[PDB]
Amino acid sequence: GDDRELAILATAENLLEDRPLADISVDDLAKGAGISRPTFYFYFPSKEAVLLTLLDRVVNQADMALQTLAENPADTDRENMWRTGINVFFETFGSHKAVTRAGQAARATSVEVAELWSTFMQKWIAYTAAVIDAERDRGAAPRTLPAHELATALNLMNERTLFASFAGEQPSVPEARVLDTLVHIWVTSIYGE
């Protein structure tokens, strides 16, 4: 039951490594999960709903990892503090590139995917802004741009730049350089005048 759903989700994540959702049939998902087509429809209404659930799992995996980091005392080294946090996103989305690629594409065609992504980006921006505000309050960061506006641009940079790196787009930062690239821009923009 839970196990049926897990098998459909695992099959979909596997097939998305090889081809887009458009070239994956319900027969393919049902076959991979060892069930019939009609039994598939008991668990999910469409292959698009399967992708929504996969992306929801990956997004909440990143969010929960960030929460675990937030619960711990702050790294006393400002650059390392931000690197560890950006690395949650680098590793979580980078470890699920098939879902990341299919989920990005689906933001265009699916209101539910677009709203899921928007909701979590707002959460992540709000958290970023609250950390920059704490750094300013402690006298560690200068009072330059409105923190929420700076947070927004930095989060959008990461959204576009990490994706271009994962997907091997031209142009892109090489995957093996993207974390250092983003950390530099975050730290100089948060701490600089």
Using CB under 6 A as the criterion, which residues of the chain lie in contact with ligand UBQ when the complex forms?
Answer: 55, 85-86, 89, 93, 100, 103-104, 117, 124, 127-128, 155, 158-159, 162-163
Binding-site partner at residue 174 among a copy of itself, ligand UBQ, none, CB < 5 to 8 Å by type: a copy of itself
Q: Does 177 bind a copy of itself (CB under 8 A)?
A: yes
Which residue in the block uniquely carries the two structure tokens 């991979």?
32
Q: How far is the CB of 100 from ligand UBQ (least distance, A)?
A: 5
∠ at Cα 126 (125, 129), nearest 5°?
A: 85
Q: Does 121 bind a copy of itself (CB under 8 A)?
A: yes
Binding-site partner at residue 76 among ligand UBQ, a copy of itself, none, CB < 5 to 8 Å by type: none
Q: How far is the CB of 31 from ligand UBQ (least distance, A)?
A: 26
Residue closer to a copy of itself by CB (options 113, 150) is 150
Residue closer to ligand UBQ by CB (options 11, 128) is 128
Written in H, E and C, the secondary structure of 70-128 is HHCCCCCCHHHHHHHHHHHHHHHHHCCHHHHHHHHHHHHHCHHHHHHHHHHHHHHHHHH
CA atoms within 13 A on the CB side of 69: 21
Q: How far is the CB of 181 from ligand UBQ (least distance, A)?
A: 12
Residue 82 Cα distances to 11, 101, 105, 184, angstroms = 35, 25, 28, 10
Residue closer to ligand UBQ by CB (options 28, 56) is 56
Contact 54, 13 (CB under 8 A): yes
Q: Could you tell me how far CA 179 lies from the centroid of its own chain?
A: 14
Residue closer to a copy of itself by CB (options 14, 181) is 181
Q: How far apart are CA 182 and CA 150, in angstroms?
A: 14
Q: Does 173 bind a copy of itself (CB under 8 A)?
A: yes
Contact 190, 141 (CB under 8 A): yes
Residues lying near a copy of itself in the complex (CB under 8 A): 105, 108, 118, 121-122, 125, 144-146, 149-150, 152-157, 159-161, 164, 169-174, 177-178, 180-182, 184-185, 188-189, 191-193
